[PDB]
Amino acid sequence: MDIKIKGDTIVSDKFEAKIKEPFIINEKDEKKKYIAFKMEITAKKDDKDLNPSSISHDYINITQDDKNTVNKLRDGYLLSDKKYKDWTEHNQDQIKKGKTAQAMFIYELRGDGNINLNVHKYSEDKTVDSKSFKFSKLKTEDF
Amino acid sequence: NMDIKIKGDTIVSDKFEAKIKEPFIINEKDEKKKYIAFKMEITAKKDDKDLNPSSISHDYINITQDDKNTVNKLRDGYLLSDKKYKDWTEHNQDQIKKGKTAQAMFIYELRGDGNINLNVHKYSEDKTVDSKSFKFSKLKTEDFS
């Protein structure tokens, strides 16, 4: 199945995610930082696999530039989430054929280099399209 | 298809060069198992997502160890934690930029106390193309808990 990024929007036969502007969660308690990608995913088929968590798992790689390497970023988990419940409460739940839900995906930052959102077809993780974000210009929310 | 060599203490290919730091044993004291550790300074020579250290070792390196009747293929090791070697393992999965060099470390599960051979083989075919040997007797050995 084929996949693209159109401006600010991921596009596939099965779904479209609108990438809201990402930002840092500064987890002040354990001096760790995450990058958070809010998104408005709208399901285009009826398919139990179409939950946001397994979308991101299935089709998205985040990486972050660094002095000698290009760093793959791990999935982030937050101690609690009263804060973002509005955007996470459906990260596990399937999306109805016509409908749109809010999702948010967290990755564990390491460094301060620019970020790349990559997109890859289901099986193969060769990057098919990408979007980059200047780190310097991302807004940063504490915890 | 791509060609490969060992020059002294260094691996050489069109895509990269690894410097083989002197290897050594991790004695995992908790589960009475030993590993051989190859620290390395890999420097990428192309731009290529496949060029991460893990998949290099996988793609191009066989370790073996001599034994009384056989010559033993050594498995890939995994350590319980790795605060200890984070310096050398944190990038084992990540790609290396066209001109840059990163520290990698590859662990193999020892079986026996025979001498070690590092073999090198082209991408597809695993016929050894070049090799280096290390006398086991003289390797330094670092514990763990």
> Where residue B85 sits, what CATH number does that domain have?
2.60.40.1240
* Residue B13: other Cβ atoms inside 10 A: 18
Q: Give residue A62's domain range.
A: 2-143
Radius of gyration, CA atoms only, chain B: 15
The secondary element (H helix, E strand) that includes residue A104 is strand A100-108
* Residue B135: other Cβ atoms inside 10 A: 9
Tokens of A119: 């997109």
A62-71 in b/e form (b: 16+ CB < 10 A) is bbbbbebbbb
Q: Give the C-alpha distances (Å, rounded to integers) separating B1 from B55, B67, B121, B123, B131.
A: 17, 32, 11, 7, 19
CA B130 – CA B141 distance, rounded (Å): 26
**Interface residue of B91, B92, B93, B101 to substitute, partner A, most A CBs within 10 Å:** B91
Please report where in the chains the tokens 């991790």 appear, as a residue.
B26
Residue B65 pairs with which residues in a beta bridge? B72, B116
CB A38 within 8 A of CB A101: no
Strands B10-13 and B24-28: unpaired
Strand, helix or coil for residue B76: strand
Query: CA of B103 to nearest chain A CA: how many angstroms apart?
Result: 10
Partner A, chain B 38-57, Cβ-Cβ below 8 Å: 49
Breaks, C-N > 2.5 A, in chain B lie after: none
Name the amino acid, one letter, at B132: K
Domain count, chain A: 1
Q: Give the C-alpha distances (Å, rounded to integers) separating A16 from A42, A44, A130, B45, B108.
A: 6, 8, 15, 37, 44
To the nearest 10°, report the CA torsion of B37, B39, B45, B46: 50
Residue A127 pairs with which residues in a beta bridge? A120
CA A57 – CA A125 distance, rounded (Å): 11
Of A2, A118, A122, A5, which is closest to residue A70 (Cα–Cα)? A118
Of B14, B4, B30, which is closest to residue B118 (Cα–Cα)? B4
CA B136 – CA B113 distance, rounded (Å): 6
* Residue A117: other Cβ atoms inside 10 A: 22
Strand, helix or coil for residue B108: strand
Specify whether the backbone of A100 is left (phi greater than 0), alpha (psi in -120 to 50) or beta: beta
CB-CB neighbors (< 8 A) of A69 in chain B: 91, 94-97, 100, 102
Tokens of A58: 């299935």
Of B104, B124, B99, which is closest to residue B48 (Cα–Cα)? B99
Contacts of B62 (CB under 8 A, 6+ apart): B73, B118, B119, B120, B121, B126, B128
A72 and B49: CB-CB below 8 Å? no
Instruction: Indicate the resolution in Å.
Output: 3.1
Of B85, B21, B15, B97, which is closest to residue B56 (Cα–Cα)? B15
CA A91 – CA A54 distance, rounded (Å): 9
Tokens of B87: 């310096």
CA A85, A90, A93 angle in degrees (round to 5)?
155
**Interface residue of A68, A74, A114, A130 to substitute, partner B, most B CBs within 10 Å:** A68
The secondary element (H helix, E strand) that includes residue A55 is helix A52-59
Tokens of B76: 């890939």
* Residue B115: other Cβ atoms inside 10 A: 16
Strand, helix or coil for residue A36: strand
**Chain A contact for B115 (CB, 8 A cutoff):** no
Structure-determination approach: X-ray
**DSSP summary character for residue B21:** P
Query: CA of A29 to nearest chain B CA: how many angstroms apart?
Result: 21
Strands A23-27 and A32-43: antiparallel
CB B133 within 8 A of CB B115: yes
Longest dimension (CA), chain B: 44
